[PDB]
Structure formats: C-alpha cells, structure tokens
Amino acid sequence: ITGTSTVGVGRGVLGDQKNINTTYSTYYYLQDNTRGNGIFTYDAKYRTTLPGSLWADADNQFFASYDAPAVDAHYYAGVTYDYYKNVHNRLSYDGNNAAIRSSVHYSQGYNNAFWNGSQMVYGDGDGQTFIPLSGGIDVVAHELTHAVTDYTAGLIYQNESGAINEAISDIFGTLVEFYANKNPDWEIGEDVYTPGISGDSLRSMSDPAKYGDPDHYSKRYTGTQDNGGVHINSGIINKAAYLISQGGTHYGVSVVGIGRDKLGKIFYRALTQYLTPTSNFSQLRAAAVQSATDLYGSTSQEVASVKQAFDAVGVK
Numbered sequence: 001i002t003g004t005s006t007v008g009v010g011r012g013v014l015g016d017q018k019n020i021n022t023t024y025s026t027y028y029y030l031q032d033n034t035r036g037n038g039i040f041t042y043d044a045k046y047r048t049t050l051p052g053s054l055w056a057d058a059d060n061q062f063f064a065s066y067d068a069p070a071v072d073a074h075y076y077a078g079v080t081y082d083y084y085k086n087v088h089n090r091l092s093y094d095g096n097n098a099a100i101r102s103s104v105h106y107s108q109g110y111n112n113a114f115w116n117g118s119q120m121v122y123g124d125g126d127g128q129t130f131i132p133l134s135g136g137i138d139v140v141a142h143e144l145t146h147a148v149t150d151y152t153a154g155l156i157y158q159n160e161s162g163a164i165n166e167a168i169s170d171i172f173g174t175l176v177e178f179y180a181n182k183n184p185d186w187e188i189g190e191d192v193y194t195p196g197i198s199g200d201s202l203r204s205m206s207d208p209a210k211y212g213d214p215d216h217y218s219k220r221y222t223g224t225q226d227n228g229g230v231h232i233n234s235g236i237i238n239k240a241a242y243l244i245s246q247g248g249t250h251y252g253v254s255v256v257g258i259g260r261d262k263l264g265k266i267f268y269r270a271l272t273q274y275l276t277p278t279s280n281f282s283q284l285r286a287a288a289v290q291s292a293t294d295l296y297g298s299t300s301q302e303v304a305s306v307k308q309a310f311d312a313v314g315v316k
C-alpha cells in the first residue's frame with residue numbers, strides 16, 4: 001500500500017526485541033520500503049488460502065504472542081536480502097529487486113515452511129516438534145534461496161538435481177546465519193526444532209550421519225520417497241561444503257579449509273553461471289572446480305580444496 005515509511009518495534013519467536021521497517025497509512029503495515037520493491041508480510045489466519053491479508057497493526061508495536069512469527073519473517077527476510085545484495089551484489093531473488101512476500105500462521109499446527117513458487121510460507125509448528133518456523137534465520141534464508149535457485153540454475157526438485165537444490169538452500173541458509181552472527185553453527189533449524197530438547201537440529205552439515213543422512217556417495221538413497229531423497233542426499237553435498245570451508249579428514253581424505261567467504265563465492269558462481277536444471281552431483285563438482293578456477297586460478301589452494309572435498313564424499 002501507499003504510505004509513510006517508519007520503524008516499529010517488536011519481539012520475535014525467541015523473545016528477542018528488534019526493530020522492523022513498516023509503512024503507515026491509517027494502520028501500520030509490515031511493508032518494508034527500504035529494500036528493493038519491498039518486503040511484505042501477510043497473516044494467513046490459520047487458513048491455507050494465500051497470501052492472506054497484509055499484516056496491519058494499530059500502534060506499530062508488535063509484542064503480542066500472535067505477532068512473533070510475523071516479526072521474525074519480516075526481519076529475517078530483510079537480513080537475507082541484505083546478504084545477497086552486500087555479499088553477492090544480487091538485488092532480491094530475481095536480480096531485479098522483485099518484491100519479497102511471506103505469509104505466517106499458515107494452517108494449524110503446521111510443521112513446515114516452504115517456497116510455493118511465488119512466496120514464502122511459514123507454519124506455527126505443533127509446539128512439540130517445531131515452534132513458529134520463521135524464528136530460525138537459517139530456515140528463512142533456506143526458503144528465500146529456493147527462490148534464487150528457481151531464477152538461476154532452475155534445478156529440478158527430484159533425484160540428484162533436487163538434492164543439489166536442497167544443499168544450496170542449506171549452504172546459503174547457514175552462510176546467512178553467520179552473516180547475521182546469530183549464534184552461528186553448521187546445523188539446520190536448531191532454533192525452532194524440538195523446544196523440549198536442547199542441542200539437536202533437523203539436519204547437520206558438519207556431520208549429516210548424526211541424523212541418519214548420508215555423508216558419502218556410496219551411502220546415497222536410491223528410493224522414491226522424498227522425491228528421490230532430496231532432503232536426504234543433500235547431506236553428501238552439505239558435508240562437501242562444510243569440508244571446503246572448515247577442512248578436515250573424512251574417510252581418510254584430508255581437506256584444507258579455505259573459509260566461509262570463499263565457499264560462498266565459489267558456490268554462488270557455480271549456481272549462477274554453470275549449473276542447469278538437470279545437473280547431477282558429478283556436474284556440480286565440475287561446476288565448483290571451474291568456479292574456483294575462474295576466481296583463484298587453476299593452481300590455487302582453493303581449487304585443490306574443492307577437488308579434495310568432493311573426493312572425500314565420493315563424488316567424481
């Protein structure tokens with residue numbers, strides 16, 4: 001809507017206070033005009049009809065429990081936009097400042113968050129397995145990254161290409177978590193997963209096997225569930241990414257880490273310049289090696305580490 005840009009204050013899912021960009025026109029709306037064509041957050045009101053109604057508030061103060069998921073979805077979408085703009089010089093997910101839209105309070109006791117091809121959607125969780133999903137910055141970044149992938153490589157959401165699609169979202173979800181410096185780690189969804197259990201997460205990039213996911217190509221899932229194991233086989237690529245950044249010896253293969261910044265630069269280039277809709281793991285390796293070569297030279301330590309990481313997880 002048309003109005004005056006202002007700043008409100010509220011509390012997120014984890015109870016932390018933060019300032020959020022809003023728009024004033026009779027009511028204060030969760031519409032951030034400071035980033036691209038805007039960031040809009042909607043209330044789905046426990047229904048499944050999307051996007052719902054643009055979030056309206058009477059006093060620009062968002063401290064009600066019902067407001068929490070909206071505050072975080074709005075705020076973290078902004079942080080993710082900042083990451084892509086400042087680190088990769090990319091304006092929004094389409095590269096042309098497309099408006100970012102998110103809906104919270106989707107359905108009832110819904111334990112998922114997703115990108116539906118046009119916007120992000122967040123459930124409130126059942127309170128046991130998950131609390132409002134927008135409370136996890138890696139979750140929000142994971143979802144917005146699916147939008148970036150759709151507009152670039154376009155990796156089909158099935159089998160190996162789908163696993164790469166998933167890994168890319170976990171990788172950048174984690175890099176954004178580090179960018180915001182919000183208790184960063186290499187775990188996925190730890191902030192909103194099982195509030196009654198501390199120290200766990202949905203997936204682990206440092207050690208995928210901790211939750212039963214494969215950490216080597218020889219252990220890849222070949223079944224039909226989960227669209228050919230897109231959330232399972234992503235562990236193989238997540239482990240490779242972790243090794244490239246942090247280093248380590250996996251299955252007897254030693255990798256010299258090159259850091260998170262270079263990991264991001266290599267994978268962003270691979271994603272935007274070399275990957276295609278049907279790329280498989282072997283092609284991802286080729287794309288990553290070529291990207292590192294473009295950026296650091298064929299005889300660089302960076303290229304060497306990329307090769308070692310993929311060798312470690314069995315991807316030739």
Ligand SMILES: [Ca+2]
Pocket residue numbers: 057058059060061062063
């Ligand atoms: Ca209020």
Ligand SMILES: [Ca+2]
Pocket residue numbers: 177182183184185190191
């Ligand atoms: Ca964390």
Ligand SMILES: [Ca+2]
Pocket residue numbers: 138174177184185186187188189190
């Ligand atoms: Ca995390």
Ligand SMILES: [Ca+2]
Pocket residue numbers: 190193194195196197198199200201
């Ligand atoms: Ca937990």
Ligand SMILES: [Zn+2]
Pocket residue numbers: 142146166169
């Ligand atoms: Zn995903």
